[PDB]
Amino acid sequence: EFRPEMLQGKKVIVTGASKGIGREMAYHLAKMGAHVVVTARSKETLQKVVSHCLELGAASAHYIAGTMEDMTFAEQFVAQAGKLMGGLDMLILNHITNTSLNLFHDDIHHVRKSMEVNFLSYVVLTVAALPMLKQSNGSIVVVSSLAGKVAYPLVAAYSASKFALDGFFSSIRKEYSVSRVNVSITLCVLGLIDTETAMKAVSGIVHMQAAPKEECALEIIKGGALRQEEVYYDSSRWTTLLIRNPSRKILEELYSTSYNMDRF
Amino acid sequence: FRPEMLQGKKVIVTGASKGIGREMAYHLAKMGAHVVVTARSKETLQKVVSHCLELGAASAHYIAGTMEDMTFAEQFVAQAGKLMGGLDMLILNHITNTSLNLFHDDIHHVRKSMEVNFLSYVVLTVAALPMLKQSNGSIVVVSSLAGKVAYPLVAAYSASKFALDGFFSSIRKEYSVSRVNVSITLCVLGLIDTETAMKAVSGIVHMQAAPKEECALEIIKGGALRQEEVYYDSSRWTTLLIRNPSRKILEELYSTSYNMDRF
């Protein structure tokens, strides 16, 4: 079904692209000959990614540095990235605020910052991107986690933000089908991935073999390109078997008609 | 369950000036609990305090304020705790005013929903936890079917309800390992016949809303019984598809896998 030609000349934004999965996605897209606009806070790190993207064969590569704690930067970043590429086909929302494993006690500012960066900025970027995505019948790719489908200790604020993404984007996907907005939304449910950040955060706590970041990056892009509603990627075969929630899907399909959406 | 389980218990009910919150305050009052009610309207809260006393509450007080203010949420709990001489049950029920609409660009509404429906619940929990640890108390979190499954027209509301599940379910795992003997009840509600819900839903939703009085009682029962989740919908079959057994399997399987000696 997937062919790398599907990404050739496509106009793609990748957030949190200076390292980890984001950087690997920028690299895969570059190899595929897409036009890429990468973002993160570090201009020096983003420059290195852009240069490697050009070397890999990107149709074009640019960066715009800024913090996703600033909603006005998020809004302006999309307009600028859209002007740089002459449009937008795929919006890959991948960035998160720095998170470490800890028992929750009273760090309200960290809960708020997690909600603002991991969730609110994704909504802001979606609003700013939607008119161009509507023009191109494009795609929104939302990077989530197993911690955004199931409960784990030590990631309360992070988990809340990832569950919020599922709630918001899954509701918006239902709205897009009724309002005939031909923009796909891909929610990516990832297990532990071998990024430097993850390996460091998890040492001495988690035993798990982490999945490779290169293949993870590719599966995200494939799912988005194929307009899949959800992408599941983890190293455990058992979680893979159990993660799907067919009963949630039946329940949503059951009540899809029960609404008189003529008013909207 | 028996109404005696709540007699003399020290309970906070948020969003208690009307709807399910008010009904919970009335049930608790009938049971002889000490209640502290909150919402923004002092005049409506005063009427709630008077009817609670007239229903047989051991004590009833109100503190008015907005849950958009995190510092109010923090101070409200300290004050409610002083008024009752402790805390046994924290019922988190308030939400910001929400109507059915397609999402377009209302970022202010998304943020406000996250602050009031989610962040304030976290704030109130942090402020309440020392007293709840003393009494081996309970946190009851009022959610919705829209907090477990996706529906159109409630994007920001659903995000905030999903966030509650993510946060409080993670905190429940942490409490079991750190031996914090405080139960956490997540209440997954279907459509309830509150005046707010009936108005918001008219001509859009073609389904019988469940009664608010029974809903209020099922929330209290679930909390008093320290149940992890309370399901209450007018249909028994959504109450069948709403459960997520594979999630429970996935969580129980991985509970041993963690080394907590760092904590």
Ligand SMILES: NC(=O)c1ccc[n+]([C@@H]2O[C@H](COP(=O)([O-])OP(=O)(O)OC[C@H]3O[C@@H](n4cnc5c(N)ncnc54)[C@H](OP(=O)(O)O)[C@@H]3O)[C@@H](O)[C@H]2O)c1
């Ligand atoms: N690694 C895993 O095991 C794992 C598991 C499940 C899901 N995920 C999802 O995978 C995505 C990528 O994680 P990853 O492990 O690759 O992370 P990473 O290697 O730590 O990268 C975080 C990316 O976010 C950018 N970032 C951090 N703070 C930011 C802010 N305030 N504004 C803008 N960008 C910011 C960082 O760049 P700078 O600091 O310059 O800003 C960097 O580009 C997250 O959505 C994560 O939830 C990862």
Ligand SMILES: NC(=O)c1ccc[n+]([C@@H]2O[C@H](COP(=O)([O-])OP(=O)(O)OC[C@H]3O[C@@H](n4cnc5c(N)ncnc54)[C@H](OP(=O)(O)O)[C@@H]3O)[C@@H](O)[C@H]2O)c1
């Ligand atoms: N009704 C349903 O069908 C239904 C279905 C699923 C779940 N639920 C859950 O049930 C709970 C109660 O809903 P309900 O239908 O009973 O709602 P309601 O009757 O509309 O009452 C909302 C309560 O919230 C208080 N409130 C609103 N904004 C506030 C703010 N900024 N600060 C403090 N308090 C505020 C309101 O008081 P004032 O405005 O004076 O402040 C009032 O006491 C919500 O958690 C809701 O998500 C309801």
Ligand SMILES: O=C(N[C@@H]1[C@@H]2C[C@@H]3C[C@H]1C[C@@](O)(C3)C2)c1cnc(N[C@H]2CCOC2)nc1C1CCCC1
């Ligand atoms: O999203 C996940 N991890 C992320 C990594 C590591 C940490 C926490 C987040 C954000 C980070 O930046 C920091 C990057 C993540 C993904 N899959 C699993 N599943 C399996 C792992 C153990 O068994 C289930 N667990 C986690 C967290 C690791 C401990 C509890 C949940």
Ligand SMILES: O=C(N[C@@H]1[C@@H]2C[C@@H]3C[C@H]1C[C@@](O)(C3)C2)c1cnc(N[C@H]2CCOC2)nc1C1CCCC1
């Ligand atoms: O939490 C829910 N409703 C709330 C009521 C009505 C509205 C929206 C929220 C917040 C309110 O303040 C305003 C109070 C809620 C609860 N159960 C259902 N399932 C049933 C609906 C149709 O089929 C199943 N649906 C809703 C929403 C109503 C339409 C889409 C989802």
